[PDB]
């Protein structure tokens, strides 16, 4: 949890327009950047929160800005460029908001504003949002290369900003299909050097709980053998979604609604045999954005999640007008929101009918349960790993390359305090111990883990976070490096310009 | 949680018949019995687990034994006597099992085997089980005085072993009525000196979810202004209950069943105005035996519970044949049981329809939620205070006389390890910090709190527990005194005879 209030309102700098750079800046280092740290921290966020006098309204509307911190021989540079999406290019051409964004209707066509994340496919990098459009970008120069429409390759209406990436480069993702949720597989780059996106295919399909209302999906779980999909009560109303938006004046937010009675349905598919498994896992209602990690343990799936307790859409609390209020009002506004909580669910793969009415979770190290009912629903209860009052452990990251899909011990996260990011956190998922890093008037980003290249342990490395520090008598922002063992500071690299909120990203080793 | 295994099987001594004493024994003190500790620890449990060659089968069937430890000027005595109930007297007369017990059908009439608890009414003390019969006992000599049939005074079929006792001596209890659940109030002793039981009355009534199947009820919550009743999915099948038992060969356990779909319904009544409040609080399924404490906070009720996650009746795992198995088998048998977990529920008293779809728990220091649905059900999620794998914090006690019904910080409990009692625990309900006391091959009882006479703080006092220590090179049992601050040992008082399991009790100051 946080130990800090924010009466000075500095968090408003997260949502203020910035200018791009024409070339990199030096970042001024205090302490010692590790000499084994070589590569680029690439991150995406909104950078332009209005077009002239026309405002963007929602957190997820501002124009995509691609950021890069470079690390070589103890030195750091910072660079950023707006992504030349259709949304951005047409906005600059016509000097107004042209494309409708998540929560901003454009007055007189799907957004490709790739403000959320960036990931590798073959030898390429793509910036993304959650639509059918992804944007190929140059990871060295930050130039925009092209727009890719996933509909030219596979049958989905969109795909999440959180694909899984296996160690050979295979990319898995999930998307709505308008009715199913489809898993897309993009193969690794082959000898022919053809674009792996042209070899995309749907490998498995998950059913939908309601023919006319698919659930919003933000991420999904993956292990060597299984795919996990969590179907929440946050629904997309297709009657509103598919009607003419410029007639009714609609955006994406306007089409969301909450199903009050379904709770959460959890789904598993066999990855290698490409089959849906018809086990009816059921639990109480929550919003889910981020899976933390998923793994197999004696034929139970361990499903660690960042939950929000409630069925109201958490995104209702993320309009910029609310995030820009003063601190007492920010706290007030969050009082009735769903409460964040880290939860471990445990899904049995072997269901014996003879155990009807009993708890199937016979593993020795968990309090999670799964009750087989007579109608064959399997009712689940979680093991809570972390819970604090409006204190969210969010934007989770792990040592992904060596523990993604596997038994693991450690997660890193951004701590939110009534939605305001104000600390960095580490959680031991076995013991429930936590570690916190926090300074007054300092607004960090998602922490990304970088292993020492020769590490044998799980947390032998560092985390990197971009911190906005608007207090006078500090530079406006800095790159923070913490030791992953205990979250103690190793170095920081200060820049002379503001940096807005960033969502997700990656470290690219060179 | 426990840090101890039990391969030697010493816990079997908890379920072995003992003899009563004709007068008190000296208990041999090591350490220092506090000099302010003056009075009697009175506890009940089973003491006779067979009649000749006819065995009792369930944990709750053995014949009531009343135990007393007396404390004066640093010295301790121990005494025990079988309660001369009908069940026990008729068993000794006819040399067989005569009355059907909870899980033992007598072959060729309600049990009054008062093996569970003891409590004060006026100037009297009554041993009890959960039926219509309570047994008046002499707290100094342990002689049995009288059988009292509550049906002579009030309309209930039974009453729990956990009445609440206000500081003036007013007694509240709850019981099934064959359909409602009735709250009984027994007034304090008046100037006329008449038996307060003859002034008993029903003051409020809770409705039942199912006309033909009332829930099992073990305890309930009380505050200065409210009464809280938790209606669980463990049901009593009245078609089986009210049929002829000697025809079918039935006991009480045979009439229980689990309702799979209802979950848990929570209920509130206004204590002083004597009215049921029609708020439909709803959550997922659990067993509940013991409320920890309940209190009011800005017109939310804070409801702290010892839960078991699941709908299967936890009492299925408590047959003596299973509790007497070897340790690996004990662990195996508990794998599919509901998982224990301490949970805080928060119940809003002011429900605004304008907040439909939102979380009503606007208190600043909890993660518990209550979602108002369109059908006006209020769906609850808990804040988990403690959770360990088959590690139950059970038999909760607090500083009851000063903090019962009131804002509080500390609870004490008996720790169960796959149902075997092997440690004592303290929980800070605000911070979730825990303290444990535990020795190898030592089986404690419920801890009971006794305040220091000059206490300033909530935990200024001791806890008393009866510990069974069957390892050779130790005496068979002892009275343990722990400092309530940190659960460090202050003294023990050893006795030269075995003591079986005890359930509940009280400290009587003199
Ligand atoms: O994928 C982007 C993250 C978004 O899903 C999400 C999920 C859960 C909480 C949340 O909070 C938004 C805050 C982030 C930091 C800036 C202030 C608002 C945002
Ligand atoms: O009111 C009497 C206690 C009974 O309700 C109960 C409630 C919850 C767990 C439990 O476990 C039984 C073990 C207690 C210690 C002896 C061994 C069995 C027993
Ligand atoms: O996670 C934050 C919102 C996301 O960036 C976003 C921004 C703009 C449009 C979106 O649309 C989601 C739909 C796309 C089509 C298929 C159904 C989901 C989603
Ligand atoms: O907590 C252990 C079981 C309890 O002592 C017990 C022992 C014997 C008979 C019982 O009967 C419960 C019913 C009484 C009549 C009304 C419905 C409950 C209950
Ligand atoms: Fe995300
Ligand atoms: Fe009890
Ligand atoms: Na600090
Ligand atoms: Na110990």
Swiss-Prot record, chains A, B:
Cofactor note: Binds 1 Fe(2+) ion per subunit.
Post-translational modification comment from the UniProt entry: Palmitoylation by LRAT regulates ligand binding specificity; the palmitoylated form (membrane form) specifically binds all-trans-retinyl-palmitate, while the soluble unpalmitoylated form binds all-trans-retinol (vitamin A).
Alphabetical list of InterPro entries matching this protein: Carotenoid_Oase
GO annotation terms (biological process): detection of light stimulus involved in visual perception; retina homeostasis; retinal metabolic process; zeaxanthin biosynthetic process
Residues the entry annotates as binding Fe cation: 162, 218, 290, 504
Listed GO MF terms: all-trans-retinyl-ester hydrolase, 11-cis retinol forming activity; all-trans-retinyl-palmitate hydrolase, 11-cis retinol forming activity; beta-carotene 15,15'-dioxygenase activity; cardiolipin binding; identical protein binding; metal ion binding; phosphatidylcholine binding; phosphatidylserine binding
Lipidation (S-palmitoyl cysteine): 208, 306-307
Function: Critical isomerohydrolase in the retinoid cycle involved in regeneration of 11-cis-retinal, the chromophore of rod and cone opsins. Catalyzes the cleavage and isomerization of all-trans-retinyl fatty acid esters to 11-cis-retinol which is further oxidized by 11-cis retinol dehydrogenase to 11-cis-retinal for use as visual chromophore. Essential for the production of 11-cis retinal for both rod and cone photoreceptors. Also capable of catalyzing the isomerization of lutein to meso-zeaxanthin an eye-specific carotenoid.
Record protein name field: Retinoid isomerohydrolase
Lineage: Eukaryota, Metazoa, Chordata, Craniata, Vertebrata
């Amino acid at each position: 949890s946080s130990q800090v209030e924010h009466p000075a309102g500095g968090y408003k700098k997260l949502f203020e327009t910035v200018e791009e750079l024409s070339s990199p800046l030096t970042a001024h280092v205090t302490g010692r950047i590790p000499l084994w740290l070589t590569g680029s921290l690439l991150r995406c966020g909104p950078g332009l929160f209005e077009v002239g006098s026309e405002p963007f309204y929602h957190l997820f509307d501002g124009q995509a800005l691609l950021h890069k911190f470079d690390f070589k021989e103890g030195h750091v540079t910072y660079h950023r460029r707006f992504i030349r999406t259709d949304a951005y290019v047409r906005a600059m051409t016509e000097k107004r908001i042209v494309i409708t964004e998540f929560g901003t209707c454009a007055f007189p066509e799907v957004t490709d504003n790739a403000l959320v994340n960036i990931y590798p496919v073959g030898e390429d990098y793509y910036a993304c949002t959650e639509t059918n459009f992804i944007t190929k970008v140059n990871p060295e120069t930050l130039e925009t290369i092209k727009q890719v429409d996933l509909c030219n390759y596979v049958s989905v209406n969109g795909a999440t900003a959180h694909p899984h990436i296996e160690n050979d480069g295979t990319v898995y993702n999930i998307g709505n299909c308008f009715i199913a949720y489809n898993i897309v597989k993009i193969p690794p780059l082959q000898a022919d050097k053809e674009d792996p996106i042209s070899k995309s295919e749907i490998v498995v399909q998950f059913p939908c709980s309601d023919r006319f209302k698919p659930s919003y999906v933000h991420s999904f779980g993956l292990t060597p053998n299984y795919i996990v999909f969590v179907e929440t009560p946050v629904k997309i109303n297709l009657f509103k979604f598919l009607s003419s938006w410029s007639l009714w004046g609609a955006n994406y937010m306007d089409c969301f609604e909450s199903n009050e009675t379904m709770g959460v349905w959890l789904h598993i598919a066999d990855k290698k045999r490409k089959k849906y498994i018809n086990n009816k896992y059921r639990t109480s209602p929550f919003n889910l954005f981020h899976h933390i990690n998923t793994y197999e343990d004696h034929e139970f799936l361990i499903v660690d999640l960042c939950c929000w307790k409630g069925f109201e859409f958490v995104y209702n609390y993320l309009y910029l007008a609310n995030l820009r209020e003063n601190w007492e009002e920010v706290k007030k506004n969050a009082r009735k929101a769903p409460q964040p909580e880290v939860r471990r669910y445990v899904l049995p793969l072997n269901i014996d009918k003879a155990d009807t009415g009993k708890n199937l979770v016979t593993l020795p190290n968990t309090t999670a349960t799964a009750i087989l009912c007579s109608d064959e629903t399997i009712w689940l209860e979680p093991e809570v790993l972390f819970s604090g009052p409006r204190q969210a452990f969010e934007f989770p990251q792990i040592n992904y390359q060596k523990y993604g899909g596997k038994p693991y011990t450690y997660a890193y996260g951004l701590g939110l305090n009534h939605f305001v990011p104000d600390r960095l956190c580490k959680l031991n998922v076995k013991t429930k111990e936590t570690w916190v890093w926090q300074e007054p008037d300092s607004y960090p980003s998602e922490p990304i883990f970088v292993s020492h290249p020769d590490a044998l342990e799980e947390d032998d490395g560092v985390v990197l976070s971009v911190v906005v520090s608007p207090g006078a008598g500090q530079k406006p922002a800095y790159l923070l490096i913490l030791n992953a063992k205990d979250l103690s500071e190793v170095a920081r690299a200060e820049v002379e310009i503001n940096i807005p909120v960033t969502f997700h990203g990656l470290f690219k080793k060179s």
